[PDB]
PDB file of C-alpha atoms and ligand atoms in Angstrom:
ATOM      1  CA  UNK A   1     -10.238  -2.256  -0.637  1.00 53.10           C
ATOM      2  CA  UNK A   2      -7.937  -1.219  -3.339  1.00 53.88           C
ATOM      3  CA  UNK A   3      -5.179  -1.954  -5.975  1.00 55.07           C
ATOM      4  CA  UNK A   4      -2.320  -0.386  -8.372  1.00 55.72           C
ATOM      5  CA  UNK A   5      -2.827  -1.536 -11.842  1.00 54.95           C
ATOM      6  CA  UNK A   6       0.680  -1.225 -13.448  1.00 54.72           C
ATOM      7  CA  UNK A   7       1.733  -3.024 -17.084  1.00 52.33           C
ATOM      8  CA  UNK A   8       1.004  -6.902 -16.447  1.00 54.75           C
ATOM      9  CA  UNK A   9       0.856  -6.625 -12.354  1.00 56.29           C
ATOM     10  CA  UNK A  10      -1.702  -6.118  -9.921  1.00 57.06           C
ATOM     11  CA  UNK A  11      -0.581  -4.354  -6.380  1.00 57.78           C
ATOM     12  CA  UNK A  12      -2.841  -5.017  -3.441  1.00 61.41           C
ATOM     13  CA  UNK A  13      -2.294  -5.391   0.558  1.00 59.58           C
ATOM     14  CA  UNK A  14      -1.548  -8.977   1.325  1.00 58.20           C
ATOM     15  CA  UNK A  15      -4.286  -9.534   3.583  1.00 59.43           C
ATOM     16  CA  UNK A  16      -6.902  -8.617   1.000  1.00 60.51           C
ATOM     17  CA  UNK A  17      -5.384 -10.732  -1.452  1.00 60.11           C
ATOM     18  CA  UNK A  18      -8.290 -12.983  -3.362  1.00 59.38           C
ATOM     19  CA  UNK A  19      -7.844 -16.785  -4.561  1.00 54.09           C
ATOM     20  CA  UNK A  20      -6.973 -15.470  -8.125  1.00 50.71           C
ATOM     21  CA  UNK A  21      -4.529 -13.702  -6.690  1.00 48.14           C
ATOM     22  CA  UNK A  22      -2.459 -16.510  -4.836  1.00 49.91           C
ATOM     23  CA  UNK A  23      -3.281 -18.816  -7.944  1.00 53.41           C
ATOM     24  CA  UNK A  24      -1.412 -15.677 -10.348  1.00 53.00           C
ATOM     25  CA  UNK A  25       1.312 -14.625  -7.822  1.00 53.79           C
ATOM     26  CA  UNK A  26       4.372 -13.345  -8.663  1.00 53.89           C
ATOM     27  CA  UNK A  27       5.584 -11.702  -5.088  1.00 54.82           C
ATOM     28  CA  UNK A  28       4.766 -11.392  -1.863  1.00 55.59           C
ATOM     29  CA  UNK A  29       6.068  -9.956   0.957  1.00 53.66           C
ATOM     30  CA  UNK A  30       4.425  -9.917   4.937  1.00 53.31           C
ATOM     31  CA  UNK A  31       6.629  -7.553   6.698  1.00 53.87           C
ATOM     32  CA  UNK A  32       4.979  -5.239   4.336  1.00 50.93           C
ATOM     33  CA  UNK A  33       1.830  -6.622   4.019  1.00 50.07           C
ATOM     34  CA  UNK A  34       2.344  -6.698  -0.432  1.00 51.28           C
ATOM     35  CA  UNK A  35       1.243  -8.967  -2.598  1.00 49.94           C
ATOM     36  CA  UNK A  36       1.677  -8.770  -6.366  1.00 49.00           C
ATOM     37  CA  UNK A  37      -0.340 -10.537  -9.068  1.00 47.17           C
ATOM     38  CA  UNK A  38      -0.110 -11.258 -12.674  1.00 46.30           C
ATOM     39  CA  UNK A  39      -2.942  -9.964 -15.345  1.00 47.58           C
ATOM     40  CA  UNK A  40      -4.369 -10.278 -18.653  1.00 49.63           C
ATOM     41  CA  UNK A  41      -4.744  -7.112 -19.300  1.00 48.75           C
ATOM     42  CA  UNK A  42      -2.301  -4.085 -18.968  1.00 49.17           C
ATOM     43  CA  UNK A  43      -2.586  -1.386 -16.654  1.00 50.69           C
ATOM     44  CA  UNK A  44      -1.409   2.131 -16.845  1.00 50.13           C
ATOM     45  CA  UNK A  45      -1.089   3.436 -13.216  1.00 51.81           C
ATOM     46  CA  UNK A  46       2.565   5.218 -13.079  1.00 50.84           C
ATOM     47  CA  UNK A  47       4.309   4.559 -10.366  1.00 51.07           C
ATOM     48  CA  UNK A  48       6.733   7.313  -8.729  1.00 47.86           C
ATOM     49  CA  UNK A  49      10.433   7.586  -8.639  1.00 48.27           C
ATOM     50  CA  UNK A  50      11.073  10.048  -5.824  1.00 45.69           C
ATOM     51  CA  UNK A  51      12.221  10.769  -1.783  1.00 43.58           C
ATOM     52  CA  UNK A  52       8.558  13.124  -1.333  1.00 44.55           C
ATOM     53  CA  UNK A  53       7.067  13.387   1.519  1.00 45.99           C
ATOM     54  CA  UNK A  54       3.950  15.221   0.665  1.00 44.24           C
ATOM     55  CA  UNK A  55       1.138  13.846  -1.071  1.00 48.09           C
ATOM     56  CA  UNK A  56      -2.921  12.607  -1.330  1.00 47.30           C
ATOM     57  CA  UNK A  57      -4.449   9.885  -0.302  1.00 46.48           C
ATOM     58  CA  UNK A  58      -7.947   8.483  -1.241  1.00 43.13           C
ATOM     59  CA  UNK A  59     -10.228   7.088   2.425  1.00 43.72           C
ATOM     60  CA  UNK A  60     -12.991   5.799   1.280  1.00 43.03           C
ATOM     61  CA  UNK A  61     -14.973   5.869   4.874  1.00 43.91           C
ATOM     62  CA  UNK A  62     -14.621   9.847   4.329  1.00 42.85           C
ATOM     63  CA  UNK A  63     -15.348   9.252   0.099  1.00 40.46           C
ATOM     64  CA  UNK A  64     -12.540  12.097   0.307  1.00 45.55           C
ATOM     65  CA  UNK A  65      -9.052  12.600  -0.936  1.00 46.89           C
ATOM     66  CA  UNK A  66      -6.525  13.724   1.752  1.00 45.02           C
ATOM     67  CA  UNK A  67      -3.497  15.922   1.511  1.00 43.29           C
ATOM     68  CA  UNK A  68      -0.555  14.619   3.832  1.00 44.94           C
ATOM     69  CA  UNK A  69       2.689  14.878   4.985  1.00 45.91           C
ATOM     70  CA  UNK A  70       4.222  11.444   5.688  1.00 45.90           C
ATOM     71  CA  UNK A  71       7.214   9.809   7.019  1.00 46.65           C
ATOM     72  CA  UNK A  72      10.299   8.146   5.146  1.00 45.12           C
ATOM     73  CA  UNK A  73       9.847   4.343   4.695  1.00 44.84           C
ATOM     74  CA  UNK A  74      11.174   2.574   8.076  1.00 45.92           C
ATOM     75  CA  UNK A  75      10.522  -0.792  10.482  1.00 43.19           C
ATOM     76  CA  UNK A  76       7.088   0.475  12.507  1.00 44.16           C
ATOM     77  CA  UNK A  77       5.192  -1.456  15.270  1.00 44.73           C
ATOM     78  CA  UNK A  78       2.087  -3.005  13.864  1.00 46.14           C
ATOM     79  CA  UNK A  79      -0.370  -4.342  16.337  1.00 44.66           C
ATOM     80  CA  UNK A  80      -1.500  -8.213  16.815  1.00 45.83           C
ATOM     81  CA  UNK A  81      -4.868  -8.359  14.014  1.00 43.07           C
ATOM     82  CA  UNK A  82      -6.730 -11.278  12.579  1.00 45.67           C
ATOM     83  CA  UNK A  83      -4.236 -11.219   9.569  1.00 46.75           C
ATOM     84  CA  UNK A  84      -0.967 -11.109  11.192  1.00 47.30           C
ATOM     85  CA  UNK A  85       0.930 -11.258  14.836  1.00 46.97           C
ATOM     86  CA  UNK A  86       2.176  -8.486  16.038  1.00 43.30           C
ATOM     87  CA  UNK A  87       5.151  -7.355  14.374  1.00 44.19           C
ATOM     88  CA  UNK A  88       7.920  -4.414  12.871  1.00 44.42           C
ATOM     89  CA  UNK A  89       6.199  -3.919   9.161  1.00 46.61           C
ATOM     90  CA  UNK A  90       8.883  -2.651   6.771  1.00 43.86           C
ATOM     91  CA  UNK A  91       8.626   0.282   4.055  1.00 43.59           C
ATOM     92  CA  UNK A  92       5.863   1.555   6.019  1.00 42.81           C
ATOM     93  CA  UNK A  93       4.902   5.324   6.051  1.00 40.23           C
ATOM     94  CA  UNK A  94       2.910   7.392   8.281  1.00 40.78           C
ATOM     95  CA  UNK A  95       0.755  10.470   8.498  1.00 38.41           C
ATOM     96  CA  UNK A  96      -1.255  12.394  10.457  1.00 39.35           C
ATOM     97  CA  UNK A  97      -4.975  11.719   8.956  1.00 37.39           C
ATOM     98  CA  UNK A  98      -8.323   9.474   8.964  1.00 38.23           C
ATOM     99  CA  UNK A  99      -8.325   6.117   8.219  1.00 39.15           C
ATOM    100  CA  UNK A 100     -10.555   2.645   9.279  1.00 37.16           C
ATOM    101  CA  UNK A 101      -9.641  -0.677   8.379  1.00 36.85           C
ATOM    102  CA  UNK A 102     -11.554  -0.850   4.795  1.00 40.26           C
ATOM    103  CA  UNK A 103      -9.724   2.135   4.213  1.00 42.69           C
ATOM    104  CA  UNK A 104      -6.506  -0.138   3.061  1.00 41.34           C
ATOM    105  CA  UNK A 105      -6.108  -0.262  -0.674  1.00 43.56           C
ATOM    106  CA  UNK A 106      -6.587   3.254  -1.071  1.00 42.24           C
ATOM    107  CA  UNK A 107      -3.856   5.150  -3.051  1.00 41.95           C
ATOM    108  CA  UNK A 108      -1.077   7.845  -1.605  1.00 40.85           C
ATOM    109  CA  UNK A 109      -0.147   9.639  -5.007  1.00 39.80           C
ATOM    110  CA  UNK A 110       2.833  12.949  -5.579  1.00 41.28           C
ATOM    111  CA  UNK A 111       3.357  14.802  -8.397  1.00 42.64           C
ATOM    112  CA  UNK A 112       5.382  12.214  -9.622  1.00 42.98           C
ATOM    113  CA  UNK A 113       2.530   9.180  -9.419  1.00 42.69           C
ATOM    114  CA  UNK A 114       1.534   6.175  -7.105  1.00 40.56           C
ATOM    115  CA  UNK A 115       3.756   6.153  -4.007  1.00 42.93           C
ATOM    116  CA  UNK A 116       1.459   3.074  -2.282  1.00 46.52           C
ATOM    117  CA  UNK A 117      -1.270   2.003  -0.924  1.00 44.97           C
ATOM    118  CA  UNK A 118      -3.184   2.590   2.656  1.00 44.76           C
ATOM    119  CA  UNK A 119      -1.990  -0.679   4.766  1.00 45.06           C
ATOM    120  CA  UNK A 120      -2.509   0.546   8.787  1.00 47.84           C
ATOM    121  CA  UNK A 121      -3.836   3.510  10.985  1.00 47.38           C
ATOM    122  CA  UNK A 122      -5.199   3.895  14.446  1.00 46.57           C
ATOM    123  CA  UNK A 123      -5.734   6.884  16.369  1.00 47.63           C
ATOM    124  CA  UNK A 124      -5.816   9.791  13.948  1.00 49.55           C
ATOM    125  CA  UNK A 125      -2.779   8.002  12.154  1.00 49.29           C
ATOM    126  CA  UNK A 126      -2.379   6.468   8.792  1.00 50.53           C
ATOM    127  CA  UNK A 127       0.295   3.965   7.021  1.00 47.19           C
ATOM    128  CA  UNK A 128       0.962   3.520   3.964  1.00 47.41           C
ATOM    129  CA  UNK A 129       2.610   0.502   2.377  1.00 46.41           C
ATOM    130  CA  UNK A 130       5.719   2.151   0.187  1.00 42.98           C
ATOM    131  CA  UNK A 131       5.991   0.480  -3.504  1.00 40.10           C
ATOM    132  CA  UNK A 132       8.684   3.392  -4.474  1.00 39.24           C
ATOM    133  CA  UNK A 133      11.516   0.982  -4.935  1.00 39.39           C
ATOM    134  CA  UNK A 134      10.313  -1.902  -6.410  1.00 37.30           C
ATOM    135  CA  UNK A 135      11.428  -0.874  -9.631  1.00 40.80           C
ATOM    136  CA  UNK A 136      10.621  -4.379 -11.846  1.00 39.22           C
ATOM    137  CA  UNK A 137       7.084  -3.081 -11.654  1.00 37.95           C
ATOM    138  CA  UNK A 138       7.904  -0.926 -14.923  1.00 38.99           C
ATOM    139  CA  UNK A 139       9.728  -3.838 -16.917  1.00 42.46           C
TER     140      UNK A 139
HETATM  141  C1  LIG B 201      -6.134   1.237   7.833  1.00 40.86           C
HETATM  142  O1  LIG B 201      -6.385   0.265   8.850  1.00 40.86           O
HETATM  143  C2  LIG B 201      -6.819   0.701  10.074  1.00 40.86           C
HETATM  144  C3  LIG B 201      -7.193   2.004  10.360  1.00 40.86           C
HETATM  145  C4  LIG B 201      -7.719   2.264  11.611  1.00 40.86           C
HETATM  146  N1  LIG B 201      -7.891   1.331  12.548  1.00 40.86           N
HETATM  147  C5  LIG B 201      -7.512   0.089  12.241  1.00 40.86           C
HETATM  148  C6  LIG B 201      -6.961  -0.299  11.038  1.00 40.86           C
HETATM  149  C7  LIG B 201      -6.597  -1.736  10.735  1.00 40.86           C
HETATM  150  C8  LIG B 201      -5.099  -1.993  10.717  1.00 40.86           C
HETATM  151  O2  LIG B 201      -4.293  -1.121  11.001  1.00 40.86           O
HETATM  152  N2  LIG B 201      -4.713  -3.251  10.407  1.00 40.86           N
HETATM  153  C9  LIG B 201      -5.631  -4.387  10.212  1.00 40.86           C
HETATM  154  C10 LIG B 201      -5.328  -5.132   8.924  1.00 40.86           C
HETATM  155  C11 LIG B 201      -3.838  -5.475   8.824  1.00 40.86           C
HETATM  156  C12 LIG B 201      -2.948  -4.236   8.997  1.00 40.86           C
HETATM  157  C13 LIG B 201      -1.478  -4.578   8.816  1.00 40.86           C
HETATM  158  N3  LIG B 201      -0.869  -4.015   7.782  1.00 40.86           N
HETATM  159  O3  LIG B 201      -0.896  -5.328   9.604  1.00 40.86           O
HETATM  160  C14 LIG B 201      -3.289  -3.599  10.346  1.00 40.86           C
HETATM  161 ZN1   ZN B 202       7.120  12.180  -5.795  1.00 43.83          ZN
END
């Protein structure tokens, strides 16, 4: 589990996505497993601007905080689960690095911020859903 709180919005993986969530949507996307909901209150979570490849990661079946090197955003095989087919997710980056799947949610920050959120793994890999470019997030 896991979200990015940013101004009015609400960032969490798709598949996790609650009731109140659908019922307050704004956007969603399932080639890369995003949803984005509308709140009440406003959220201060800054999200990066940047091309870095080196960052932290929180996996909460470790309660630890990872530091990772991790792949450019790109089109990567996701295997057939109870959520989805299988299927080419988009914006997804990986890294070398624990991860299980309650682990998703769990934030990749840089210097500059939030760079996304943990959204596959499997065998000593982890992928992280990118949320980089969508820029409306901050207006
Ligand atoms: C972090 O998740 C895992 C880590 C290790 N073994 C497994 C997983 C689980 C995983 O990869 N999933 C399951 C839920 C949907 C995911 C998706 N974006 O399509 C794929
Ligand atoms: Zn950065």
């Amino acid at each position: 589990s896991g979200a990015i709180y940013v101004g009015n919005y609400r960032v969490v993986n798709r598949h996790l996505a609650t009731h109140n969530d659908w019922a307050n949507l704004v956007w969603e996307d399932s080639s890369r497993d995003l949803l984005v909901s509308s709140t009440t209150a406003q959220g201060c979570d800054t999200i990066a601007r940047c091309d870095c490849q080196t960052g932290v990661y929180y996996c909460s079946s470790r309660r630890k905080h990872y530091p990772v090197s991790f792949s450019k955003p790109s089109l990567i095989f996701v295997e057939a689960s109870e959520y989805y087919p299988a299927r080419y997710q988009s914006h997804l980056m990986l890294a070398v690095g624990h991860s299980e799947p309650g682990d998703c949610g769990g934030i990749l920050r840089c210097q500059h911020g939030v760079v996304g959120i943990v959204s596959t793994g499997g065998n000593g890999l982890v992928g992280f859903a990118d949320v980089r470019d969508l820029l409306w997030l901050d207006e």
